[PDB]
Amino acid sequence: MKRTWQPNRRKRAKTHGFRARMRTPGGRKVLKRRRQKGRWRLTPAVRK
Amino acid sequence: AVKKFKPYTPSRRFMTVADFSEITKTEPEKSLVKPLKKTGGRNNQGRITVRFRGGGHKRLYRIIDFKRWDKVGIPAKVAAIEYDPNRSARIALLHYVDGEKRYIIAPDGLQVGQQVVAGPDAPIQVGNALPLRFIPVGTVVHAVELEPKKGAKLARAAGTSAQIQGREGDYVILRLPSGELRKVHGECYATVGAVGNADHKNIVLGKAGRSRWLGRRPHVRGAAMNPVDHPHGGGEGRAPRGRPPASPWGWQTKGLKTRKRRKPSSRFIIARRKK
RNA sequence: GAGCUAGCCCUGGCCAGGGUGAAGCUGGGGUGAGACCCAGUGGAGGCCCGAACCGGUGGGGGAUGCAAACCCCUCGGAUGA
RNA sequence: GAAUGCCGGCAUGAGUAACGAUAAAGAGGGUGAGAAUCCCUCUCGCCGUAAGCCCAAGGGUUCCUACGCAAUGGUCGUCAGCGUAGGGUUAGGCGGGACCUAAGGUGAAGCCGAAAGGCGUAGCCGAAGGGCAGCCGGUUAAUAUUCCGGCCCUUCCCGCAGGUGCGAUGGGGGGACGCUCUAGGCUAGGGGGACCGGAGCCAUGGACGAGCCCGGCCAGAAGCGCAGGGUGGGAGGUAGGCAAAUCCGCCUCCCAACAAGCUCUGCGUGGUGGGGAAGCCCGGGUGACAACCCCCCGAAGCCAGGGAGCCAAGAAAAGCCUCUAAGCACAACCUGCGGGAACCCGUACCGCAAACCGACACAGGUGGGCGGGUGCAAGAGCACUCAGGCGCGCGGGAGAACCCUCGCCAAGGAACUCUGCAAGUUGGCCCCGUAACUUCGGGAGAAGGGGUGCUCCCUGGGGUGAUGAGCCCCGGGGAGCCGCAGUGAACAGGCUCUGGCGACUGUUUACCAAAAACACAGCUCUCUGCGAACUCGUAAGAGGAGGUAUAGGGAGCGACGCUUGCCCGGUGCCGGAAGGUCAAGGGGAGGGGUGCAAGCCCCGAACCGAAGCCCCGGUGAACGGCGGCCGUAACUAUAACGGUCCUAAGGUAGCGAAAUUCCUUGUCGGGUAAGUUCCGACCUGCACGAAAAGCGUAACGACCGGAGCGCUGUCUCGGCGAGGGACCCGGUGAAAUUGAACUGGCCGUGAAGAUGCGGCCUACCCGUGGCAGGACGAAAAGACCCCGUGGAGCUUUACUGCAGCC
RNA sequence: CGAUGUCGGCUCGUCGCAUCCUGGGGCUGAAGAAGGUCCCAAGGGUUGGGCUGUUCGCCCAUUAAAGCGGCACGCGAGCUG
RNA sequence: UGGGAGAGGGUGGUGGAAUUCCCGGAGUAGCGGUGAAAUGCGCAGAUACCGGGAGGAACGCCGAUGGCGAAGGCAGCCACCUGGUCCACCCGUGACGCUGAGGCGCGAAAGCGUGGGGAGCAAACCGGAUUAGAUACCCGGGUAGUCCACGCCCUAAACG
RNA sequence: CCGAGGGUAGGGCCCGUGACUGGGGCGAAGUCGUAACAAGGUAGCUGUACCGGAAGGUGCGGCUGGAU
Ligand SMILES: N[C@H](Cc1c[nH]cn1)C(=O)N[C@H](CO)[C@H](O)c1ccc([N+](=O)[O-])cc1
Ligand SMILES: [K+]
Ligand SMILES: [Mg+2]
Ligand SMILES: [Mg+2]
Ligand SMILES: [Mg+2]
Ligand SMILES: [Mg+2]
Ligand SMILES: [Mg+2]
Ligand SMILES: [Mg+2]
Ligand SMILES: [Mg+2]
Ligand SMILES: [Mg+2]
Ligand SMILES: [Mg+2]
Ligand SMILES: [Mg+2]
Ligand SMILES: [Mg+2]
Ligand SMILES: [Mg+2]
Ligand SMILES: [Mg+2]
Ligand SMILES: [Mg+2]
Ligand SMILES: [Mg+2]
Ligand SMILES: [Mg+2]
Ligand SMILES: [Mg+2]
Ligand SMILES: [Mg+2]
Ligand SMILES: [Mg+2]
Ligand SMILES: [Mg+2]
Ligand SMILES: [Mg+2]
Ligand SMILES: [Mg+2]
Ligand SMILES: [Mg+2]
Ligand SMILES: [Mg+2]
Ligand SMILES: [Mg+2]
Ligand SMILES: [Mg+2]
Ligand SMILES: [Mg+2]
Ligand SMILES: [Mg+2]
Ligand SMILES: [Mg+2]
Ligand SMILES: [Mg+2]
Ligand SMILES: [Mg+2]
Ligand SMILES: [Mg+2]
Ligand SMILES: [Mg+2]
Ligand SMILES: [Mg+2]
Ligand SMILES: [Mg+2]
Ligand SMILES: [Mg+2]
Ligand SMILES: [Mg+2]
Ligand SMILES: [Mg+2]
Ligand SMILES: [Mg+2]
Ligand SMILES: [Mg+2]
Ligand SMILES: [Mg+2]
Ligand SMILES: [Mg+2]
Ligand SMILES: [Mg+2]
Ligand SMILES: [Mg+2]
Ligand SMILES: [Mg+2]
Ligand SMILES: [Mg+2]
Ligand SMILES: [Mg+2]
Ligand SMILES: [Mg+2]
Ligand SMILES: [Mg+2]
Ligand SMILES: [Mg+2]
Ligand SMILES: [Mg+2]
Ligand SMILES: [Mg+2]
Ligand SMILES: [Mg+2]
Ligand SMILES: [Mg+2]
Ligand SMILES: [Mg+2]
Ligand SMILES: [Mg+2]
Ligand SMILES: [Mg+2]
Ligand SMILES: [Mg+2]
Ligand SMILES: [Mg+2]
Ligand SMILES: [Mg+2]
Ligand SMILES: [Mg+2]
Ligand SMILES: [Mg+2]
Ligand SMILES: [Mg+2]
Ligand SMILES: [Mg+2]
Ligand SMILES: [Mg+2]
Ligand SMILES: [Mg+2]
Ligand SMILES: [Mg+2]
Ligand SMILES: [Mg+2]
Ligand SMILES: [Mg+2]
Ligand SMILES: [Mg+2]
Ligand SMILES: [Mg+2]
Ligand SMILES: [Mg+2]
Ligand SMILES: [Mg+2]
Ligand SMILES: [Mg+2]
Ligand SMILES: [Mg+2]
Ligand SMILES: [Mg+2]
Ligand SMILES: [Mg+2]
Ligand SMILES: [Mg+2]
Ligand SMILES: [Mg+2]
Ligand SMILES: [Mg+2]
Numbered sequence A: 001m002k003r004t005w006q007p008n009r010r011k012r013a014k015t016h017g018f019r020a021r022m023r024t025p026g027g028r029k030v031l032k033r034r035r036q037k038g039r040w041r042l043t044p045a046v047r048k
Numbered sequence B: 001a002v003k004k005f006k007p008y009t010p011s012r013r014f015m016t017v018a019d020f021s022e023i024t025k026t027e028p029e030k031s032l033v034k035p036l037k038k039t040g041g042r043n044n045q046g047r048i049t050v051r052f053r054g055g056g057h058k059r060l061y062r063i064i065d066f067k068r069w070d071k072v073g074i075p076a077k078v079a080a081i082e083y084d085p086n087r088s089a090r091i092a093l094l095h096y097v098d099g100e101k102r103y104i105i106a107p108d109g110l111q112v113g114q115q116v117v118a119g120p121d122a123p124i125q126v127g128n129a130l131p132l133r134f135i136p137v138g139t140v141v142h143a144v145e146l147e148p149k150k151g152a153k154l155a156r157a158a159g160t161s162a163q164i165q166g167r168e169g170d171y172v173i174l175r176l177p178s179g180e181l182r183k184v185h186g187e188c189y190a191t192v193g194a195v196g197n198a199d200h201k202n203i204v205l206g207k208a209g210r211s212r213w214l215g216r217r218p219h220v221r222g223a224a225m226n227p228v229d230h231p232h233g234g235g236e237g238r239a240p241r242g243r244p245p246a247s248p249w250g251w252q253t254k255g256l257k258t259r260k261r262r263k264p265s266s267r268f269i270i271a272r273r274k275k
Numbered sequence C: 001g002a003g004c005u006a007g008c009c010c011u012g013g014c015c016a017g018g019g020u021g022a023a024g025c026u027g028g029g030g031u032g033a034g035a036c037c038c039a040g041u042g043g044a045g046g047c048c049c050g051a052a053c054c055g056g057u058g059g060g061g062g063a064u065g066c067a068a069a070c071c072c073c074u075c076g077g078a079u080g081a
Numbered sequence D: 001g002a003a004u005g006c007c008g009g010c011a012u013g014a015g016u017a018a019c020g021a022u023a024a025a026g027a028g029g030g031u032g033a034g035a036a037u038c039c040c041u042c043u044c045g046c047c048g049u050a051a052g053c054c055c056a057a058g059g060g061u062u063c064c065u066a067c068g069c070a071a072u073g074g075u076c077g078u079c080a081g082c083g084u085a086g087g088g089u090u091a092g093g094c095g096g097g098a099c100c101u102a103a104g105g106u107g108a109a110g111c112c113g114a115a116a117g118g119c120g121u122a123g124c125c126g127a128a129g130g131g132c133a134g135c136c137g138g139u140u141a142a143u144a145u146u147c148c149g150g151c152c153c154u155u156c157c158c159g160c161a162g163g164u165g166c167g168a169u170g171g172g173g174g175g176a177c178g179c180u181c182u183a184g185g186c187u188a189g190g191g192g193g194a195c196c197g198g199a200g201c202c203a204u205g206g207a208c209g210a211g212c213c214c215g216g217c218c219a220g221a222a223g224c225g226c227a228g229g230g231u232g233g234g235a236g237g238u239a240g241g242c243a244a245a246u247c248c249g250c251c252u253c254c255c256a257a258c259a260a261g262c263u264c265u266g267c268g269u270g271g272u273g274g275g276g277a278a279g280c281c282c283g284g285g286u287g288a289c290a291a292c293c294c295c296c297c298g299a300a301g302c303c304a305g306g307g308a309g310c311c312a313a314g315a316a317a318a319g320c321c322u323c324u325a326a327g328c329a330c331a332a333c334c335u336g337c338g339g340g341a342a343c344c345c346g347u348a349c350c351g352c353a354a355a356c357c358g359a360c361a362c363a364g365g366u367g368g369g370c371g372g373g374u375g376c377a378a379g380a381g382c383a384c385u386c387a388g389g390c391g392c393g394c395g396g397g398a399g400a401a402c403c404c405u406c407g408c409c410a411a412g413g414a415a416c417u418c419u420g421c422a423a424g425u426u427g428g429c430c431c432c433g434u435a436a437c438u439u440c441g442g443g444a445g446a447a448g449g450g451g452u453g454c455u456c457c458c459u460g461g462g463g464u465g466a467u468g469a470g471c472c473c474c475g476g477g478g479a480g481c482c483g484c485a486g487u488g489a490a491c492a493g494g495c496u497c498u499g500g501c502g503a504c505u506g507u508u509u510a511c512c513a514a515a516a517a518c519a520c521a522g523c524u525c526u527c528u529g530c531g532a533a534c535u536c537g538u539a540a541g542a543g544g545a546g547g548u549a550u551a552g553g554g555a556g557c558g559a560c561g562c563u564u565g566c567c568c569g570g571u572g573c574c575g576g577a578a579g580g581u582c583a584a585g586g587g588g589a590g591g592g593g594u595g596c597a598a599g600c601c602c603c604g605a606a607c608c609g610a611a612g613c614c615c616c617g618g619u620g621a622a623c624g625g626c627g628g629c630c631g632u633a634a635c636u637a638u639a640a641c642g643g644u645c646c647u648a649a650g651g652u653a654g655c656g657a658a659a660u661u662c663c664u665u666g667u668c669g670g671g672u673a674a675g676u677u678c679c680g681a682c683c684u685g686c687a688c689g690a691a692a693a694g695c696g697u698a699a700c701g702a703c704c705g706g707a708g709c710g711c712u713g714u715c716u717c718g719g720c721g722a723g724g725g726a727c728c729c730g731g732u733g734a735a736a737u738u739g740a741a742c743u744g745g746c747c748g749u750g751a752a753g754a755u756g757c758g759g760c761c762u763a764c765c766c767g768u769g770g771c772a773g774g775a776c777g778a779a780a781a782g783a784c785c786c787c788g789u790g791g792a793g794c795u796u797u798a799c800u801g802c803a804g805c806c
Numbered sequence E: 001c002g003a004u005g006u007c008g009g010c011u012c013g014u015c016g017c018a019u020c021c022u023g024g025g026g027c028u029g030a031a032g033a034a035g036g037u038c039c040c041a042a043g044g045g046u047u048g049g050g051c052u053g054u055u056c057g058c059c060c061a062u063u064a065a066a067g068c069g070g071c072a073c074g075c076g077a078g079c080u081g
Numbered sequence F: 001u002g003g004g005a006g007a008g009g010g011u012g013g014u015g016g017a018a019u020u021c022c023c024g025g026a027g028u029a030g031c032g033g034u035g036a037a038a039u040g041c042g043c044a045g046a047u048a049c050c051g052g053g054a055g056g057a058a059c060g061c062c063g064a065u066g067g068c069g070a071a072g073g074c075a076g077c078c079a080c081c082u083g084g085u086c087c088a089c090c091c092g093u094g095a096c097g098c099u100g101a102g103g104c105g106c107g108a109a110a111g112c113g114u115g116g117g118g119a120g121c122a123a124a125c126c127g128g129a130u131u132a133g134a135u136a137c138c139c140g141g142g143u144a145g146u147c148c149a150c151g152c153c154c155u156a157a158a159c160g
Numbered sequence G: 001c002c003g004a005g006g007g008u009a010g011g012g013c014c015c016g017u018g019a020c021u022g023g024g025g026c027g028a029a030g031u032c033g034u035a036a037c038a039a040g041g042u043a044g045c046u047g048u049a050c051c052g053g054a055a056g057g058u059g060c061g062g063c064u065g066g067a068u
């Protein structure tokens, strides 16, 4: 049957993307934390 | 004269439709329609604030002239009478000798080809608009302004009207469609006659589908819900109300007056509604 | 977190084929004029049968599955909320 | 040494289950160390509204070629979507951007919020909608509307010629729209041809034939033709389209009008450029100088912004045309022609799937287009089949039980069972015919029956032609032929009588409930006069509604018919300028602390002082309520009638052993040989009853009862047969579980149900196929039940706060 | 209570005997036939239907008879539900 | 042809008296009602009086032993549309007539449907009396209805 | 071919009968009240509507077949 992951590149960038995170207090704290932890990718990788 | 159907379906047995007799034009004036942003009952926060809305037919909003003192003394020919999906009344397209065109809501008795005019000097005939002070006490009247220059607010639905009952100073006393007796300022404009399409209220929707066409989604009784949802919720089997009948939000919905007590307009309402 | 799900908003798309035959219209009959009756025309409908499509009624299977809800046979809707 | 401990390693179950659709395989030839599994050929089977082909998501090199086989592949592997390497994606016209707006998002101005932030007209962003210029063929191992070939086209710059009051983010027109139905003419696609082109074939009894088999087109500027779309022309007036206007709007006048005219699209033709089968021979060559024509069918596509009808009344903005403003009028724009200029990103491959979502090469899920032929009334249904693609990545044998899916069965025919559950039966089309009841629609496919193939003969109307032949479509009458059987295969209702509940179509517990539940049109009460009520938000702002009482909110009830009684004492709501109670505040009789003092400071009575409660009244489709005792009538029984207690008042009409009835299988009647169910009655209704509506009601229902006819492996009662497993051999190889085990019966005993203790009995050692009685078998730290001064959801006249309102 | 699945049916039995039948007896208010009651006896047998989930029970038609109990109210790693 | 009388009918306008309710003023101890009473209303200011307003229904005097209509029935006033009827002239037609099974139309009140309207009245209903009782008669309340539109119902001591 | 009739299926009319139920006629020796006939103690009757143990009452409109 229809499962829960239905990938959609535009939906991905517009929801979790860098510019979405930076718009918002919570989103900037996400990037701070990812950077502080040393994450290699601050944001999901999506192709455009 | 409402139109009836033979019972060739279960729903056609009761369904009735307007007869659209007075209608003479089946196309809106292009310069006078604009897109009507459907809301679904949802406010600017995205939240339902009026339950059970949405999903009805697409509509263009026709710009209606609710001032009319906009063009004192400039007469106009009643060019057409059109259907309007945004109100119960029909609308009349006016061609002004000015060259300008606009709509008013169609009074009862308006005739395509007759002329109308607004102003302190206009004849007391159907379709004309005047400040309230120059209309004879006793005439029925519609599309009444509440305060001067603020637009027509009263008696706008199909078959409605107000009646001038007397004068008192700068003000004149109206009986609103609700039977309320109210002072309205005498410089407020109004339009002699009653609103047309009186047979509107005799329409039988007929089936659940017709409500849906109108944007009315199904309405769910409190008694059909659970206690998280509604005061009338829960109970084993059916249940009587078990408490004073209440809204989804807990206030009582039989009798409880809701008009604000210290409201300034109270000084101008002579007698609360009948019935 | 509404890429699942629920509702709404905007903008597009889909619904083989067959059946029933409302109003109206024309003709005739009728009448003082009508109502109305008959034929033909007409093509209405949360109309009928039935694929796509949407479902999930009863039974059987499956049960460390092909599958963390599937399969077969049956069955509901299919111009409409 | 234990924590159902943690991490790791390794056992057991066990050579066991399984190896993922039952569409299917066989042989020959090659390659190689090795072959059921790779390549090639022949034969067989499967899909063919796909299991074929195109596109969009998503995936991201999986594409092509060489060389490989450790691992991945459920086996094998020489093969591969795997390892290594190299190659491969070419655009002014295709898609997106350098264009437009939609919801929404953002947001100059502005508004609001402790901060963070929330809003917000314009503007901007935002597409699968608008707009916009490329078709056919050829070429590579791999790209092609991109390269090449042919024939076309768009925009920008510059120039020339002609023309014009040129000029815009401003005005206007236009863009610009629904659903159902549908005309005319075409095209796509298809069928046929005695005609045209073609390698060839004559079998096995016949056929050298009007024989078989194959093919008989595609693109194309201008011009022309056919068919459609769009559009009235001129003058005068002008106060409206936030400036101006010659434009548009409005008024009047004049020729014109279902015409033509002008304009645009489709289709055809069209210079020219292409393609071109079978068979044959090793993708290619040949066929071939290929032919390239006639007839029929014919779209849901095109002309198109076509037409009619209906109500639920059907985006925007730019491109484009026109108007004028500053400006500028040696400019600028328009038209034609010429030369130059024309950027960025995508393009491989998979794409109903082994490359996407599902941990898997997973029987599941995934939007758009094309989807041939014949037959069956039609069709995208069904069967078969084209092109095209496949045989589903373990095989070989065997022919037990048992399982699954399937076929048939004597006599009986529901006797099965909770229930005809399941499976039979019925089954399409044409004709005949068809009941109660009914809201006159229906019920209705009611029920029931007859017809159905093929051949010859005669004949009726239509479409295309021409009015005829030819073709194609709809029929009618007669005479015959064969079989068990003619919708001969496949797809395709069993029916009736009678109750309950719900009017109806709909909706729901994604994954145990589809219903009688929810919704529903309709009915009533109630709130709301508009800066509405109400909802969300601290606010601003929004919804409501660009609505205005024939409207909007809330609540109950639930089509329709006939109806909906009595009680307002309590509660709620509504009304009530009197009274009673009432907080802060006002007031300040009087009293107190201190000071030598003027003074400073504290307490404080009467009296005034809201809402709310108290008090008076109204109100039931507001919360709700709607009795008991004794007596009495020519026999008995009963009680119309009387008395009496109590109440706010004592249940009306209708209905009743009911979705309600305890006693209970009440009693009686019906149906049955037999009826705890069913239906019809009665009424001592444990414990119906009138909008948590009462009693009915045609039609409807995958709802839940009862009965009958038809027909059956449901059963008496079982038998045989088929295939997929089970079994045997080769290959690969799990699982929960497991204190260790050398693990028998009885009668006893034992923490009360013992392989393990006692006594006796029985018993050589070890497996395989089978069955499930035990190992208080496995699984899950019992959901029941209790306990914990454990938790959480929900309620209220529990307590105490808060929002909100007064 | 770190689980011992609960009514009824189906299937499959097996045991007890306080015996329903069949076999053997004594007593009788046993003439015969038929029955009553007690003793012995567990070898075999002990029907098909209607109603209801029913066990039970009632009823129909038969019968030599239409027995009653135990086996975790025998039996859900055997089925039903 | 020429005239007459009339609540004949239909539509629309419109005038005054009275009842009820509401606002203002003035006023106070009751009012109302009956056979007599009581319920009811009234110091929360009633009744009686004056001023203003709303709204519905019915039209006093004329009015009659009257008029008109086929019957049911029809009554302020005005206008329009329209029926029947009588009279005088004796002009025209030339038996064109009478009746009427079926048919069709009209048909008081009550009643029904849909929607308005609602003052007064008033079934049902509630209360007070009366009474042996009083599901009545009398009194105080009160919903349908009585009124308008449209469509039904088709009855009567529809009687002379 | 037609055909007595037989069989299958569905309709129409008629008669007999049925748990139970509706009122009616008669009986008369009962119980309740007294609706009508007098102004019958509320004049009567009336079509209709709503109500009540019962005769009946009330409403609306009608008739006199109404006493004073
Ligand atoms: N039926 C469950 C057994 C079960 C369910 N799942 C796993 N075991 C049950 O109640 N079991 C318990 C034993 O664990 C017990 O035998 C029991 C069985 C039945 C009853 N009862 O009153 O019908 C009570 C008790
Ligand atoms: K336990
Ligand atoms: Mg999706
Ligand atoms: Mg992904
Ligand atoms: Mg995307
Ligand atoms: Mg996208
Ligand atoms: Mg998205
Ligand atoms: Mg973003
Ligand atoms: Mg910061
Ligand atoms: Mg990581
Ligand atoms: Mg790094
Ligand atoms: Mg992140
Ligand atoms: Mg009309
Ligand atoms: Mg109708
Ligand atoms: Mg109709
Ligand atoms: Mg009709
Ligand atoms: Mg119908
Ligand atoms: Mg119906
Ligand atoms: Mg409408
Ligand atoms: Mg209509
Ligand atoms: Mg109209
Ligand atoms: Mg339109
Ligand atoms: Mg516009
Ligand atoms: Mg709008
Ligand atoms: Mg809006
Ligand atoms: Mg917004
Ligand atoms: Mg937001
Ligand atoms: Mg809503
Ligand atoms: Mg309208
Ligand atoms: Mg209307
Ligand atoms: Mg309605
Ligand atoms: Mg609508
Ligand atoms: Mg509802
Ligand atoms: Mg519920
Ligand atoms: Mg919630
Ligand atoms: Mg709560
Ligand atoms: Mg609550
Ligand atoms: Mg409740
Ligand atoms: Mg409940
Ligand atoms: Mg209950
Ligand atoms: Mg419930
Ligand atoms: Mg409930
Ligand atoms: Mg319910
Ligand atoms: Mg309750
Ligand atoms: Mg409130
Ligand atoms: Mg105001
Ligand atoms: Mg759209
Ligand atoms: Mg469809
Ligand atoms: Mg027809
Ligand atoms: Mg028509
Ligand atoms: Mg149709
Ligand atoms: Mg249909
Ligand atoms: Mg349908
Ligand atoms: Mg249908
Ligand atoms: Mg769906
Ligand atoms: Mg299923
Ligand atoms: Mg089945
Ligand atoms: Mg089966
Ligand atoms: Mg499962
Ligand atoms: Mg399936
Ligand atoms: Mg299936
Ligand atoms: Mg269907
Ligand atoms: Mg269809
Ligand atoms: Mg439908
Ligand atoms: Mg230890
Ligand atoms: Mg363990
Ligand atoms: Mg463990
Ligand atoms: Mg461990
Ligand atoms: Mg561990
Ligand atoms: Mg070991
Ligand atoms: Mg192992
Ligand atoms: Mg084993
Ligand atoms: Mg497996
Ligand atoms: Mg199969
Ligand atoms: Mg091999
Ligand atoms: Mg091969
Ligand atoms: Mg095909
Ligand atoms: Mg991937
Ligand atoms: Mg490639
Ligand atoms: Mg590769
Ligand atoms: Mg390998
Ligand atoms: Mg290998």
Ligand SMILES: [Mg+2]
Residues within 6 Å of the ligand: none
């Ligand atoms: Mg290697």
Ligand SMILES: [Mg+2]
Residues within 6 Å of the ligand: D072, D073
């Ligand atoms: Mg492997």
Ligand SMILES: [Mg+2]
Residues within 6 Å of the ligand: D074
């Ligand atoms: Mg695998």
Ligand SMILES: [Mg+2]
Residues within 6 Å of the ligand: D080, D081, D082
């Ligand atoms: Mg591979």
Ligand SMILES: [Mg+2]
Residues within 6 Å of the ligand: D065, D086, D087
């Ligand atoms: Mg290479």
Ligand SMILES: [Mg+2]
Residues within 6 Å of the ligand: D091
């Ligand atoms: Mg190019």
Ligand SMILES: [Mg+2]
Residues within 6 Å of the ligand: D098
């Ligand atoms: Mg550029």
Ligand SMILES: [Mg+2]
Residues within 6 Å of the ligand: none
């Ligand atoms: Mg833009």
Ligand SMILES: [Mg+2]
Residues within 6 Å of the ligand: none
């Ligand atoms: Mg913002």
Ligand SMILES: [Mg+2]
Residues within 6 Å of the ligand: D127
């Ligand atoms: Mg776009």
Ligand SMILES: [Mg+2]
Residues within 6 Å of the ligand: D132
């Ligand atoms: Mg383009």
Ligand SMILES: [Mg+2]
Residues within 6 Å of the ligand: D134, D135, D152
């Ligand atoms: Mg081209």
Ligand SMILES: [Mg+2]
Residues within 6 Å of the ligand: D140, D142, D143
């Ligand atoms: Mg290439």
Ligand SMILES: [Mg+2]
Residues within 6 Å of the ligand: none
């Ligand atoms: Mg110009």
Ligand SMILES: [Mg+2]
Residues within 6 Å of the ligand: D168
């Ligand atoms: Mg412009």
Ligand SMILES: [Mg+2]
Residues within 6 Å of the ligand: B033, B060, D176
């Ligand atoms: Mg528009």
